[PDB]
Design a protein around this ligand. Structure first.
Ligand SMILES: [Mg+2]
Lengths: 114, 36, 46, 97
RNA sequence: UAAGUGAUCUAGAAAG
RNA sequence: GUAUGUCUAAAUGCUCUUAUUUACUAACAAAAU
RNA sequence: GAAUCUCUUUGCCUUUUGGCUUAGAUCAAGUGUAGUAUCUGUUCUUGUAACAACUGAAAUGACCUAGGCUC
């Protein structure tokens, strides 16, 4: 019952491998886990303007974003991500990408950096 | 904001709870007195 | 605390990620160099 | 598994759900995505549940699309989504029984 | 001619 | 200290991949020779 | 003289604010620290003739009191 709980109770018949298999079988059917744009909490490094309503969301402002994987990676084996945000006033989907060549981000049809 | 000051406190009487408070437990049943 | 993003995997400005990127570049870069030289040699031969 | 979703789709929970399904017949038709092609659902109860779910979805869609910033494109998009939902519902009202 | 005996604290769980 | 809130009418088995994690959480704490 | 309406000034008006704390703290950081959680595809699904038998189903509505014949 307590966040540092050592052992979760299992039923008396719990073939772990079998259980895993079952879960897998019922993971394609599952709504969540079988989808993109999984949530995340992030502060905004770019400090940018929301292109619709010009709301000047500043640096380090916290948002409940959606992180999604971009299939087209950078180079070969180092992934890059789309990080969706909403502007506070108008609900326009701002987002950005993390191209690690410059050790920084790229704006993605959301707003503009300034 | 709601970080707000105040105007007045309160005192309204409900049905007692019947909870065994630690301090409320008995202690110093004997009252002292003066000499006269 | 201050800047949250600093405690995220996806954040590229996180140092680990940067290191990884560098490593990737370094390996790939090396490969390119190896191939580049070969290409040059071939050109010379031609 | 912060933020609850992870917890929900943690293996143990999934296993529990499966067990429930097996013995007694507790499904959560909220939890699984409704199938695209009907007529791969021989049971009636399941079909009914699916229909209910779609109705709920439609209702949800309706509730949001009358919001004050009406000129925004999300609302417009939903209008098509709403239509789709309606169509789905209609389909679910098939005439096998 | 006589050294070298004994004194020994502790001690983890929750939430924040 | 892993926030929160509204919203709810009453295909089947199969196998193969791993020396990893699209992992998530930051309420917690912050210095040199 | 009395009734009323319109404008200006004075009075009355949010000529502007409902807490405290180290101005609450900081405009900085390869972070550290604690926790919580599991994944990749590919597939299985005989004809012809003769003899014996039937000539026809389903829908809802027209009669009578769910049942019974007719159209
Ligand atoms: Mg507290």
């Amino acid at each position: 019952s307590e966040r540092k709980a050592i052992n979760k109770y299992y039923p008396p018949d719990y073939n772990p491998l079998e259980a895993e298999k079952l879960s897998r079988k019922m993971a394609k059917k599952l709504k969540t886990m079988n989808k993109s744009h999984a949530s995340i909490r992030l502060m905004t490094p770019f400090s940018m303007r929301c292109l619709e309503c010009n709301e000047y969301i500043p640096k380090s402002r916290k948002f409940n974003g959606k992180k999604e994987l971009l299939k087209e990676k950078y180079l070969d084996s180092i992934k890059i991500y789309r990080l969706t945000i909403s502007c506070p006033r108008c609900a326009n989907s701002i987002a950005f990408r993390t191209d690690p060549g410059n050790s920084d981000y790229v704006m993605e049809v959301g707003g503009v950096r300034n | 904001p709601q970080l707000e000051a105040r105007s007045g406190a309160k005192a309204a009487a409900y049905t007692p709870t019947g909870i065994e408070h630690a301090r409320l437990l008995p202690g110093h049943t004997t009252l002292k007195y003066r000499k006269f | 605390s201050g800047d949250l993003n600093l405690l995220k995997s996806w954040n590229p400005k996180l140092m680990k990620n940067r290191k990884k990127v560098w490593e990737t570049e370094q390996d790939l870069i090396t490969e390119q160099q190896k191939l580049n030289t070969r290409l040059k040699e071939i050109e010379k031969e031609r | 598994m912060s933020r609850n979703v992870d917890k929900a789709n943690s293996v143990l929970v999934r296993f529990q759900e499966q067990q429930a399904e097996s013995a007694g017949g507790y499904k959560d038709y909220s939890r699984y995505q409704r199938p695209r092609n009907v007529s791969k659902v021989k049971s009636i109860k399941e079909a009914n549940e699916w229909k209910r779910q779609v109705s709920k979805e439609i209702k949800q869609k309706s509730t949001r699309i009358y919001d004050p910033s009406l000129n925004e494109m999300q609302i417009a998009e939903l209008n098509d989504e709403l239509n789709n939902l309606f169509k789905e519902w209609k389909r679910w009202q098939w005439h096998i029984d």
